[PDB]
A paper describes a structure:
In order to incorporate an additional electrostatic interaction across the D1-D1 interface, we used a Thr765 to Lys mutation to introduce a charged tether onto residues forming the opposing electronegative pocket (for additional rationale). Alone, this mutation had little functional effect, but coupled with the K759M mutation (K759M/T765K), current decay slowed several fold, and the additional mutation N768T (creating K759M/T765K/N768T, or MKT) yielded nondecaying current responses. First, an additional crystal structure grown in the presence of lithium revealed that the electronegative pocket was partially occupied by a lithium ion and not the opposing Lys residue. Second, in MD simulations of both the double- and triple-mutant receptors, the T765K residue failed to make continuous contact with the electronegative pocket. Overall, these structural and functional data support the premise that the Lys tether is not a permanent feature of the T765K mutant series. As anticipated, lithium resided in the putative cation pocket for much longer periods of time, confirming that removal of Lys759 impacts the ability of lithium to bind.
AMPA-type (AMPAR) ionotropic glutamate receptors (iGluRs) are composed of pore-forming GluA1–GluA4 subunits (Dingledine et al., 1999) that coassemble with a variety of auxiliary proteins, including the transmembrane AMPAR receptor regulatory protein (TARP) and cornichon (CNIH) families (Jackson and Nicoll, 2011, Schwenk et al., 2009, Tomita et al., 2003), as well as CKAMP44 (von Engelhardt et al., 2010) and SynDIG1 (Kalashnikova et al., 2010), among others (Haering et al., 2014). A network of electrostatic interactions at the apex of the AMPAR ligand-binding domain (LBD) is essential for gating by pore-forming subunits, whereas a conserved motif on the lower, D2 lobe of the LBD prolongs channel activity when auxiliary subunits are present. Our data identify a network of intersubunit atomic bonds at the apex of the LBD that are critical to channel activation with pore-forming AMPAR subunits.
Numbering used by the authors:
A (entry chain A), B (entry chain A): 392 to 506, 555, 566, 632 to 774
Write the structure that this text describes.
């Protein structure tokens, strides 16, 4: 029937511009883990689709004042897209307003440092002031710190929320640049999936340190009650069980890694 | 209103008999990760409940001939329990017949050996015949091997399905005993969660080797369409985000580990 509108986000290696994108149109402009996953889910569910990059470049948060959702979550809530296929964390507040598949990838929050930075853990970050640290805006990592009752994470949030200049970034790439350019004086808190990808990219100057701070998952999201949710969830489980999700992770993370 | 009937399974450290169980009655007979999780979910959802150990001691599989489900899955499908709170793997075939929460624990299939056994991987097992290996009956690990199209896992299944004497066991404890007693000539394929627990128990003679073979999760299950599913799923996500699931994992795996 109708073309399914897929909201997604330009986040490497999930969705990236193809080298020759300026000559290409439509879905062919893009490549990556989520582009491949969208093709697999569409094939299993039997729909045609159009990939659309979220206008505001955000994952999704609800404004405390207006109660309005932004980002990909907002695109689903307000009826501007039919499905989100992206590294979108399954969270309580989001689950209350959109539907999610079972997870297609497991992850947790992690620490990225410039190589040689003397930090091995969140506790280490929390006990010093020389090295600044922050998170992405409008996403689940920022919310993790804002809501935590665990002393070390509350201490980190109390620092981050009032730090000057701001420690928060608008995109993962801006966080990576800040780590790379800050001579060891900025560390970035981000999901293990993104951190592990970046560690395999030139110039090979970052690394993931410490254990993950939490354990959670990304899911494919649909507007609440959409008939697409049920077949999409069954497709995710099938792809998981057939080993396809594992093959795609290796393809986009490790197969052409650049750091040895 | 009505007392919720919870089906569960005696699998350490998820549900275990308390030391003084012979003097105790009802839910007080039991302790463990799933006993604590049931209490937390009941508190958040506001129900009273009765823990019941599944009669046949199985997780759940569908008989190819009769199409009848056994185990905890069968208890839900046939209306004998209201909810399953257990280390029950979220799988495609189960998702088609019962509802599941988002996962409360992440895991994958793994290899348990007696210390000193010269095996480091599934590929190693598959390329030799001196060391026998098998899985639990009536569960998701056996089904993983039976359905895999990946050459190494298909080769392992072709061996396991015809091995004599049988390499399959009825309970995890029987698998552990077979590893411990077989002088290095049996290796057991089981979920990483169970393997990591057993590695911390006396006599400290087993170990987990190699990476996990897959990535998946346990969920709380309800009969399809039950009104309990929605609040239970929101409770799982809340407990996840508050760090309670992490606290319970540490409590039952590591806090009183016996092997250093
Ligand atoms: N996956 C996150 C974005 C990344 C982050 O917050 O670190 C989300 O869905 O909000
Ligand atoms: N968690 C598995 C049981 C253990 C196994 O198969 O290794 C299930 O739900 O079937
Ligand atoms: Li939801
Ligand atoms: Li289901």
């Amino acid at each position: 029937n109708k073309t399914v509108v897929v909201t997604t986000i330009l986040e490497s290696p999930y969705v990236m511009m193809k080298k020759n994108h300026e000559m290409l149109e439509g879905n062919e402009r893009y490549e990556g883990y989520c582009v491949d996953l969208a093709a697999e889910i569409a094939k299993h569910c039997g729909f045609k689709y159009k990939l659309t990059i979220v206008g505001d470049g955000k994952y999704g948060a609800r404004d405390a004042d207006t109660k309005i959702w932004n980002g990909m979550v907002g695109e689903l809530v307000y009826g501007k897209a039919d499905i989100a296929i992206a590294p979108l964390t399954i969270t309580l507040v989001r689950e209350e307003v959109i539907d999610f598949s079972k997870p297609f990838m497991s992850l947790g929050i992690s620490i990225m440092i410039k190589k040689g930075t003397p930090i091995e853990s969140a506790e280490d970050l929390s006990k010093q002031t020389e090295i600044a640290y922050g998170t992405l805006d409008s996403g689940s990592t920022k919310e993790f710190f804002r809501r935590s009752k665990i002393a070390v994470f509350d201490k980190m949030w109390t620092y981050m929320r009032s730090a000057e200049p701001s420690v928060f970034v608008r995109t993962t790439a801006e966080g990576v640049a800040r780590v790379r350019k800050s001579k060891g004086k900025y560390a970035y808190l981000l999901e293990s999936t993104m951190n592990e990808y970046i560690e395999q990219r030139k110039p090979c100057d970052t690394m993931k340190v410490g254990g993950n701070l939490d354990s959670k998952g990304y899911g494919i999201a649909t507007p609440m009650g959409s008939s697409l949710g049920k077949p999409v969830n069954l497709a995710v489980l099938k792809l998981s069980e057939q080993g396809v999700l594992d093959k795609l992770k290796n393809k986009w993370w490790y197969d052409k890694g650049e750091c040895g």
